[PDB]
Ligand binder design. Sequence first.
Ligand SMILES: [Zn+2]
Ligand SMILES: [Zn+2]
Ligand SMILES: [Zn+2]
Ligand SMILES: [Zn+2]
Ligand SMILES: [Zn+2]
Ligand SMILES: [Zn+2]
Ligand SMILES: [Zn+2]
Ligand SMILES: [Zn+2]
Ligand SMILES: [Zn+2]
Lengths: 336, 336, 336
Amino acid sequence: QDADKLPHTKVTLVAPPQVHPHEQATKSGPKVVEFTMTIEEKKMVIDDKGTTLQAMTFNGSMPGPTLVVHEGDYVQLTLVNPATNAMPHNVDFHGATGALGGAKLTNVNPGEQATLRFKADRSGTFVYHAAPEGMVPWHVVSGMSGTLMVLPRDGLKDPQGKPLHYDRAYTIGEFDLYIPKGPDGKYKDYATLAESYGDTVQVMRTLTPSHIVFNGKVGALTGANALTAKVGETVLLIHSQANRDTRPHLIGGHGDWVWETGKFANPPQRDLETWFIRGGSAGAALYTFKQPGVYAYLNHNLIEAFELGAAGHIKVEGKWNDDLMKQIKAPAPIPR
Amino acid sequence: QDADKLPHTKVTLVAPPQVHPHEQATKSGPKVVEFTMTIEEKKMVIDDKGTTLQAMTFNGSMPGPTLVVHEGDYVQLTLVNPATNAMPHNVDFHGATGALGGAKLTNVNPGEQATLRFKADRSGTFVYHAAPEGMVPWHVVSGMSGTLMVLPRDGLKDPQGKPLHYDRAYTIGEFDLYIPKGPDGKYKDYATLAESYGDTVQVMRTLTPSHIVFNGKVGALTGANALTAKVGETVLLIHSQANRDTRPHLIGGHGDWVWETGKFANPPQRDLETWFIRGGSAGAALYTFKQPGVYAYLNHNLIEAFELGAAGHIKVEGKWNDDLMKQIKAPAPIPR
Amino acid sequence: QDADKLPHTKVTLVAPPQVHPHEQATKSGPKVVEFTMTIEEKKMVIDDKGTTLQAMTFNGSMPGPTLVVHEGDYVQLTLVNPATNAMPHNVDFHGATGALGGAKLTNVNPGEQATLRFKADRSGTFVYHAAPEGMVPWHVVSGMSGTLMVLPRDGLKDPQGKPLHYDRAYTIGEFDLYIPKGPDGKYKDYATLAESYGDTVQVMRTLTPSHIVFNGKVGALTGANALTAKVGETVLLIHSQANRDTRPHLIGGHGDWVWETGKFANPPQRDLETWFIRGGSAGAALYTFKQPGVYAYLNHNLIEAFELGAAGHIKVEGKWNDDLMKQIKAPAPIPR
Ligand SMILES: [Zn+2]
Ligand SMILES: [Zn+2]
Ligand SMILES: [Zn+2]
Ligand SMILES: [Zn+2]
Ligand SMILES: [Zn+2]
Ligand SMILES: [Zn+2]
Ligand SMILES: [Zn+2]
Ligand SMILES: [Zn+2]
Ligand SMILES: [Zn+2]
């Protein structure tokens, strides 16, 4: 079909880690699916000792919201760069074909907006990210990425073609941050975004992040903001990393079905302990909970997880199953 | 089946790089398979210039021993933390479901033991490692990991379902070490384990290991301690890395059949030159030797292998095959 | 067949990024395919601010040329080390079986040559690299690697066994470089190759490259030296990394069919955004261009690409397709 002859629909985005309401399998034919995002540059507190980032975001969040369409839909995005921002921006969709992912067609200075349409002709989770000429890595590592999910029109399938469902989807964006320090050994705090640029590029070139965070801060997905589920529920965990490799793992769980390269026309792998998201990609895992409790979902470079920030929690309600795991003898003195 | 109604069997563990005797395909029904491991904290010499590590081990070795069961068995582990140790420990099995892999059910202070049972309901090689609250990466990088192998009850299979066998299994645990240096540029030697903690965490956060070793020391699997095989024999090479990515390679060989993500319900890949073990996982490769000689088995970041320690040897007996490789002209002067 | 009873053919190599003329599917039976390469040590300018590398090359280029054979052929290489070089060299073929990949049979001092034959019995892209005893990583990171491609005799196939073709092949070798700096913060320039050794090894052990380049220099595959193609053409992109992981990506394109582990008896994955080449391997991707313009082909650690050098261009001729991507509204003032 010709996109100019198709019906249009408008989607209201939601903030991560939620994903906007959508169908899995659908009876709908292809549509032009309209979205809007507004860029917001802002200073953000990223850890528990007051460190700040001169951040750059789509729609005020790290990651930007997840956009969901079905294969054969057209994505039509209006990208807005308000006059209160300092820098030019654009967007590169890995799900799109041509013009550097759309980056060449979406160059917006502060005070400007643009609208891009592209055919979502390949199923999968795909990164989108800013890519302004001459300062591409800086905008990405400062927060400008998220995920486009293009579902098969018949929903997700296992390697034999059997249907797979999820009850809840969550989106996790992992961000390798490069916060400079001064000669006093303290992280720098900058009054403006432009002031932070040359110091940050120097840290970037060391390839050693100061922090690695989920969803914008150490501990973002913990406490009141933990992910939630129940025994018997199947969750889809979408994981994006626009710049650097990561290795997701659910402590005390598994990836039941995982597309680590994130492309749903390929058969998934089952029973994974840890999977691998290549820098510059998004992947997806399904898991059905069988035990209650508080799980950790983390990057299994455990230094990156526990020392630098790349870890969250999932609080799961339900009945403990002693067939799967039982404490036979609690900790007690060693017999002599 | 209900584990409380099943027969029990006890396994005697052996030290790496060997793997305790086991069946591949079996006619046995499911069992409760009992194991015991005793934690040993100890100072270890890890290189040829006298550098020491304040190490932490399962059963006195790096890696801990490999535990082998079949899918549908229950693993029942007694974990002992003698009063001669300084730190609390526990164990997280990636092969297990619930309670942070069993970590929440196995918290043993010095002087204590505990017994955990879990269903091994997924086939594959899976990491196990210590994970005490608040100091998880330190115990892992100090030596506390090994592998659980859960074999399919019908043995290993290729992508078309044809049977695959091994004649010998070897287990290789690769350890990224973070040994601090003092202001004199020498590696530090500590009188106690606790003394080493804060200096080590600082090195860990740089994400740059001082050493990367197989099986506890530079050169551990060389000389008298080389792996061995013969032409015509098929070996299974189990490779674990609980914290950091690695890329195994057999110089002058291949991975005939490789499960790089380590999960036997997925079809393996064939003819690999180099495979990839995600940090936080164990994988497995089969190879049938066709040429005699001394092979190297290494991490193919060659700096990590040759400069930092991530390399071993395999000495293979048998008849040279000129059909596979022949020296046509030995080194000699260039003609003019 | 017995190689001594087969017909011989001689191939004239070409310089990267081209690949010598070859058939995909062939009616030919197996042959002994003869090649010659001459080692050249030379100082090379690797960036736009005059930094030099004391380099080591096969046939004067980084990477060495790509050698193409079909499965069941024998590769017969004459390796020449002229008396104008300073160091001993050899070659390790990951496509070969035995004698450390051929390294033990090809030890050539300056003034010597040797000839090696091996059976190419496994299909795929395979790294070859120098591996002289005691200085293996130094020769590799200084430039001594390239690719052997062993095509299936029936050409490339998709996961269902349907034929796949390419119209043009390009070879990209990615090199992590370790250029020392002096106490003045400037990169060192050395008068001889041997002078550079101890300083370079120290940088290598930090695991942080100073530069990461395609094909021997920052910008090597840009400007007049950009790759080229047309809409409707299918290209094969061969990517080698002998020492360190990389994550190839085509901006505004995809990997239509990708063998990321590089072994053609395994089914490829489709629709990839970014793929993963393990250090010590070569992989291959097919893409059919659908839009004209200048694409970037890069390592999607964007710091590694844009700050350190791991990026090239592909200039593609043809007709823009608004069905795939259209600018609906060009950048303009935000409405109030
Ligand atoms: Zn319309
Ligand atoms: Zn459900
Ligand atoms: Zn990108
Ligand atoms: Zn019992
Ligand atoms: Zn055998
Ligand atoms: Zn773990
Ligand atoms: Zn002949
Ligand atoms: Zn064509
Ligand atoms: Zn090699």
